[PDB]
DNA sequence: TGCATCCGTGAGTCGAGGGTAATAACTGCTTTTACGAGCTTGCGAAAACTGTAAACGCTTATCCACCCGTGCGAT
């Protein structure tokens, strides 16, 4: 009763949160530095880290 | 004199299947290095040709002694 079973859909679950985190980090240092009235969300979002 | 932080240990053969990926600038300007192009020597081959002591087969000049050109003889 104190330990528990993790299976597949959890674990690819925790590692799809890992790889958004790093959208995380390229979207906040994008709206700042980034043009305005020509970025769309397709040009800021990275394919690669996640 | 404990008390608290720290360094260093932890069997052996095999075995199977393999190697990663996040993200990073543009410009003009000047010096160095490579790649192909075109000669210059030179070096190993092909195809002819002028010096010597044997160089493949073959004639003679000799000498001489087996044999016998013949004659005549042996019982």
Same mark, same amino acid.
């Not at 299976?7 to 979207?27: C, H, K, T």
């Not at 994008?30 to 996640?50: E, F, Y």
């Given at each position: 009763?104190? %330990?528990?079973? +993790?299976? @597949?859909? $959890? ?8 790889? &958004?985190? %790093?959208?995380? +980090?390229? @979207?906040? $240092? ?8 020509? &970025? ?11």
């Amino acid at each position: 009763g104190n %330990r528990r079973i +993790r299976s @597949v859909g $959890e674990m690819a679950e925790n590692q799809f949160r890992v790889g &958004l985190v %790093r959208v995380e +980090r390229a @979207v906040k $240092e994008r709206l700042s530095l980034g043009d305005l009235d020509t &970025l769309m969300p397709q040009d800021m979002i990275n394919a690669k880290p996640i």
